[PDB]
Design a protein around this nucleic acid. Structure first.
Lengths: 134, 167, 117, 260
RNA sequence: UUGACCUCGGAUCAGGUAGGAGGACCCGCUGAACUUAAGCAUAUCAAUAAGCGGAGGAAAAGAAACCAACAGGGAUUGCCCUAGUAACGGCGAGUGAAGCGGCAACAGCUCAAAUUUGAAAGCUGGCUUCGGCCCGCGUUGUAAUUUGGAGAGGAUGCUUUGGGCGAGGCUCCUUCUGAGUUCCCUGGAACGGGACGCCACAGAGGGUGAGAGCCCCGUAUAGUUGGAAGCCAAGCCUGUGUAAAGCUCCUUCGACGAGUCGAGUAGUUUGGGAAUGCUGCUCAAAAUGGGAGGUAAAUUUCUUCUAAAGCUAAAUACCGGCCAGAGACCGAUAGCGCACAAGUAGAGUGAUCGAAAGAUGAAAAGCACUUUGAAAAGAGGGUUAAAUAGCACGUGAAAUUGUUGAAAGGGAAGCGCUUGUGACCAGACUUGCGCCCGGCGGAUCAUCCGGUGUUCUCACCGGUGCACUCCGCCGGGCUCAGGCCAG
RNA sequence: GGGACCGAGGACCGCGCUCUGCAAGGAUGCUGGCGUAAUGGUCACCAGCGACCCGUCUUGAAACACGGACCAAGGAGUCAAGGUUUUGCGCGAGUGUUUGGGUGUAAAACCCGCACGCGUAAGGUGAGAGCUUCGGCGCAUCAUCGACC
RNA sequence: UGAGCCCGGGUCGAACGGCCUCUAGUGCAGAUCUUGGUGGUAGUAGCAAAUACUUCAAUGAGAACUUGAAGGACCGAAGUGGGGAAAGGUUCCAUGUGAACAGCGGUUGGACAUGGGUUAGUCGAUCCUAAGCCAUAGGGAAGUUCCGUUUCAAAGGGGCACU
RNA sequence: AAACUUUCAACAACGGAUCUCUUGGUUCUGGCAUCGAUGAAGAACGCAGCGAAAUGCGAUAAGUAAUGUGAAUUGCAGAAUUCCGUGAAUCAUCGAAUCUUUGAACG
């Protein structure tokens, strides 16, 4: 149950914020979970998705199929996974809009910024685990 | 209303005001009250733990059960069983229990330094000249015009001499 | 009794709990500022004026000059140590004088002073 | 809004025109021109008796009657059939006025939520908690649009002592659905008789019982009421020896034969 | 001849400031009528609406020329009662306070009247190497001291301090912090059902292809990363001048606001001709003075305050400003006129008036290709769970209309009662129970023994029972009861 | 002797008689066909009989007059203050917490100081409900004579 | 009995209901009611006068009102002619379309769409003042502002000089 | 018999009711006090590769500087980013600027 007066339980305001969020807030929203191997490798549950990530689609009509992210289309809250496409009437292939909450990350695109993000998430998680343990 | 519609229609962001207040709601600092204050408790509860009176007036309602913070004459003069024309003006000659109260008592009764005012250099040479020409006769020192141009009284001169150390 | 426009002059107290919370937060703001000190000043005991209410006493505005002098509390120090002063009131009676000096003696006995700096 | 329906300039056309004697909007270059206004039967018009903020939303109730109702709710909660009638699953629980040990309720050992759930399971509130949890579902109507999305049943009410049990059991609880907490020195009728129905399942503590006696002694201007009857068992009252001995002989049977 | 002072001017001189907007609330000015009542007139609406001027985050008011008559209270503001009382009203319509009392919040001060006269000690500029240099204002008075429940001056003896750094802290923004996408079924898609788990100071809310605590954002508490400005502040550097301050005593003093009070008069206003206040005109003050009350008390005794100069936070108001959180509210003819490129399209010379209009689909996957057609489109074909969703798009009523099916109809139709014809339908029944035989096949026949439970005499298990006793099936026979219409 | 319509009730009880039983406080027995659109029902039409177009308004009543092209949606005794009658509830010579204050899981709930609002600080004669130890006691209230202010 | 309640079949796609209390913007045939939609009348009234049209050929799917040629009529310099002022504002020109408008139609159009088009020392404005108006000096007015226009305004130019 | 008028049904039309939804309104509560000659409120004209309106901006014109974040924008077209980097973005913050004609509007 909410306690802090700053947060609001208003459905109207929550939906307005979600559907009028800017691109950075949309990135944070389109964060996606990591695989189990990455989970015990980095002590991180979820990370924002990006263009170079390899993901596994595990929800929707595409049962258990893998592929590299092609584009994170922040405008309609979808990502494009390589080779997950449907043919139009003309026979031209168009990518299928898939959701980061429906995908799971298998291989992670690594750079200094994302290494820092992983380090911060891990540091917080381990600090709280140590505080709870002792 | 038109301004609100304009804001909701424009792409400029909403200037969200942080919830700042003019006055703080809890004691702060490195003092006893600040270190012993509980912010999840109320004023009366904090003062009851401290052993202090918060309100010196009449009770405007029912308090909590544990609340302790809301308080021969020959001449036949009524003020005879009250005694213990000049009084001290800058302080009062005042004469099992909570830890905060005991700590406050110790800080209040803790000895303090005074920082005794000095006599200026020229005042010292002036007094020195007075005693060098007269010695200890403060009446002559006061009646002297060359060395005492301000015509200060003998009692004042004697007091300044005692403070200077020249008797 | 509605010959005037009470509709445009009508007021509702829907913020009674809000104002109660605001006033309580103001009293805590005063006690956060004046933390070891009481959040009020010592007020004298005064007899109510008319024949209807002269059998009872209440709290007055401030203590009189000569009753402060009899209590032994200097004038320029009383408002500083937290005693309200009323230069308009006259005692006119040893009964009021004695009651207020006894009250000030009780305040003296229960007061703690800190030595300047 | 007090300005609703009155932000227009309309005047009746007259009497002899073959149109309704209703105010009509002036103008002449829009759909709104010539249309009725200022009436409760007209589109985009004022409503009959517009709502006002001075509706007397609150009800003043005598504090003596409030205390009477609270006492009656406590007696009903003590009664066992009334819990079942109110809809509480109390069949694996003994001693309907449950008293759970304050040494087992006070501190972190209940401040942990899993521990509070384990205590409820051990004492027998598990059926009620599971009933609430399975009973959660969506509301029918506009409350979903107005912030009342779901609704569920109400579980046990936990009465404790802030000065003996220590107020942290609320945080240990406060997340189990349906389960509510309350201090003994301030009991709430909305919690004691939810929806106006008596017999809520309550778990107490020993300090709660002590302080319940203490607070009902400490109420000022109120004493525990005396009932207008002394024995509520009408079966014993009637079939007692005195009544039946002074009683007259029966004048007939329950179902009497018809003669003609 | 020259030089000062006074007064009045110039400058695109040096440096500043006002105008307008907003006006929800606030301070003033100005100022109605509709309405109600009454022979009539005053009154009421209303000291309101409209108009004009002026501020702020609040404004305004405010530290008694007050209230009282008591044992007195003690600046202002607001709430509760006082009270629909006093009071004024053809004692009509009616109008209509305040003292006391309970509470919220409380805070007190600055001048003018005195000579610094052993010392204009005061201040604006603009030139600066930032240290002090000049120009000036000002004696027709700028500092210090004092402001009448006071004060000054002397004497006297105690008691009082001033600056500059400043770790750190508080407030607010930010970084980070729990747990299933395990298995089966339906489904286009599980967020649905079932199974087994987990987290919970977090089961608020939202998104995700259908109802998700554990997929994602967030949500709870403690911390933690960096930043912002305000205030407090442990300590540390210094301090100075015969500098300032409080009190005490007294063979010395003690200045308090004028075209203002007041008197007459006119208008306006108030519950208020001791005029309730205000304004205009005429006259025009006082110093043991002046103002307001008390009082038959024997004379105007007594009581209580100092007006005509000024400042001041808080409790108070708020349809406007920057936000935030909520609701037993409304749900596209509703809710603001406006859920939409709405104060828009449009109308009026103009002041102004002022609408209608939301929804494909999870995803455009918004129909490739073939054929007819001048084309618009149609027909195949295709996407989709669905085209009985084709951007004339969720669902898709009635009024009204077309086609097909059946029927009726010699100057109205429609409606009630009762048949008949044709079409189309809901029920009811499908056998149940109990005895006589045989075949069986099994397990809980009676009684007794132990344990347990209970209504303390009833049961339940386990043993005993060994199958002319129980319990189910089959192949037969008979009884009773079974639907509709009738004799 | 012939015909028509009806069969309410559901162990026994009662009144009776013509009493091994009965026509006596309400129908049973025997039998047949069918067991399905057969009975029954709903629609449409025919047939015999019946049958002014609704509302408003006026009047003693009619007539006149007025409104009515059809459909969907909207649409009209509400809220507040002050009085007053009755019903329910709590306390009761008292009653009213919610001005305000104290807690709070925080517009909820719980608690309360001093005021304040409104109210409060003796019989006789005869009946009489209800009790009685059947000798009489005597509610409320009424009529009269009373007593007091 | 009734207001109504329940089920089946078809359509549809995301929430809804029974029971006990609470609450109200709670129940329609009328109000010459409001908004919207839809009928009969009804393919009915009606689509004017300016005398007048005809043949061939061309474009086009389609030609009475689109064009070329030929006839037959008309405005008759006080024009049915050629240019302007005011107002409008791209209507001008070329190409394309035929959804809507042009009381019929259209290949046509002042329609819709896409491009293009207005060149000045000598033409007009730009300069001057006319009737009249505004500011300034003053003076009214509670004030927004009013009177006032040469007024009892220190109001405008120019020159000379061995410094 | 057909046609026509009327009744009922099936399907198809007209129309947009019902149900469901809602980045909207309405009411209440809470923290805070900030327009303008350093040129406001308002009006106008310009600015995008392809834009009319809305929105943003002002010839530095759907914007520049700085800080933070950390890999986009999106209808199309063209460039990016080396990703082990002073760095994408119709991103956010925001302390520096640019800021056409008017409008209290001021040669």
């Amino acid at each position: 149950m909410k306690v802090r007066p700053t947060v609001s339980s208003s459905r109207r305001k929550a939906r307005k914020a979600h559907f009028s969020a800017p691109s950075s807030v949309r990135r944070v929203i389109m964060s996606a979970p990591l695989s189990k191997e990455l989970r015990e490798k980095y002590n991180v549950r979820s990370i924002p998705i990006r263009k170079g990530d390899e993901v596994q689609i595990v929800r929707g009509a595409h049962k258990d199929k893998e592929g590299k992210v092609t584009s994170v289309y922040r405008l309609k809250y979808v990502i494009h996974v390589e080779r997950v496409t449907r043919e139009k009437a003309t026979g031209q292939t168009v990518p299928i809009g898939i959701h980061p909450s429906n995908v799971v990350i298998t291989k992670l695109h690594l750079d200094k910024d994302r290494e820092n993000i992983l380090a911060r998430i891990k540091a917080g998680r381990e600090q709280v685990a140590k505080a709870k343990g002792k | 209303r038109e301004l609100q519609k304009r804001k909701r229609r424009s792409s400029r962001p909403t200037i969200r005001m942080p919830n700042r207040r003019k006055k703080a709601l809890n004691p702060a600092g490195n003092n006893i009250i600040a270190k012993s204050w509980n912010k999840k408790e109320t004023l009366s509860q904090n003062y009851t733990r401290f052993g202090l009176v918060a309100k010196l007036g009449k009770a405007t309602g029912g308090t909590a059960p544990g609340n302790k913070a809301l308080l021969s004459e020959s001449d036949a003069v009524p003020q005879q069983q009250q005694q213990e024309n000049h009084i001290r003006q800058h302080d009062l000659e005042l004469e099992s229990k909570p830890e905060v109260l005991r700590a406050l008592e110790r800080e209040a009764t803790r000895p303090v330094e005074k920082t005794v005012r000095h006599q200026s250099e020229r005042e010292r040479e002036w007094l020195q000249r007075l005693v060098d020409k007269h010695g200890d006769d403060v009446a002559a020192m006061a009646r002297d015009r060359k060395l005492n141009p301000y015509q200060q009284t003998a009692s004042d001169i004697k007091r300044r001499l005692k403070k200077a150390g020249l008797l | 009794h509605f010959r005037k426009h009470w509709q445009r002059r009508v007021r509702c107290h829907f913020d009674q709990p809000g104002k109660k919370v605001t006033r309580r937060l103001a009293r805590r703001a005063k006690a956060a500022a004046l933390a070891p000190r009481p959040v009020d000043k010592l007020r004298p005991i005064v007899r109510c004026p008319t024949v209807k209410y002269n059998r009872r006493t209440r709290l007055g505005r401030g203590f009189t000059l000569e009753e402060l002098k009899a209590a032994g509390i200097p004038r320029l120090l009383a408002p500083t140590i937290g005693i309200a002063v009323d230069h308009r009131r006259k005692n006119l009676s040893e009964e009021s004088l004695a009651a207020n000096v006894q009250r000030l003696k009780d305040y003296k006995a229960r007061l703690i002073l800190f030595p300047r700096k | 809004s007090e300005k609703a329906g009155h932000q227009t300039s309309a005047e009746s056309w007259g009497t002899g025109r073959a149109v309704a004697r209703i105010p009509r909007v002036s103008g002449g270059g829009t759909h709104r021109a010539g249309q009725g206004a200022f009436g409760n039967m007209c589109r985009s018009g004022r409503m009959f008796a517009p709502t006002k903020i001075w509706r007397k939303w609150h009800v003043k109730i005598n504090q003596g009657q409030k205390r009477f109702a609270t006492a009656s709710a406590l007696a009903a909660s003590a009664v066992a059939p009334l819990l079942m009638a109110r809809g509480h699953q109390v069949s694996t629980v003994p001693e309907v006025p449950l008293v759970v040990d304050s040494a087992a309720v006070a501190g972190d050992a209940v401040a942990k939520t899993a521990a509070a759930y384990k205590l409820l399971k051990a004492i027998g509130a598990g059926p009620d908690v599971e009933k609430v949890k399975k009973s959660k579902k969506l509301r029918a109507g506009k409350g979903k649009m107005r912030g009342r999305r779901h609704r569920q049943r109400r579980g046990p009410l936990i009465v404790y002592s802030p000065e003996h049990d220590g107020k942290e059991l609320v945080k240990g609880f406060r997340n189990i659905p349906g389960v509510e907490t309350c201090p003994v020195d301030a009991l709430n009728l909305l919690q004691l008789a939810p929806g106006g129905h008596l017999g809520r399942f309550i778990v107490w503590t020993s300090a709660a019982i002590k302080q319940l006696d203490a607070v009902y002694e400490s109420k000022k201007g109120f004493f525990l009421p005396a009932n207008i009857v002394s024995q509520a068992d009408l079966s014993r009252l009637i079939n007692s020896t005195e009544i039946q001995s002074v009683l007259r002989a029966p004048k007939g049977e329950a179902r009497t034969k018809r003669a003609c």
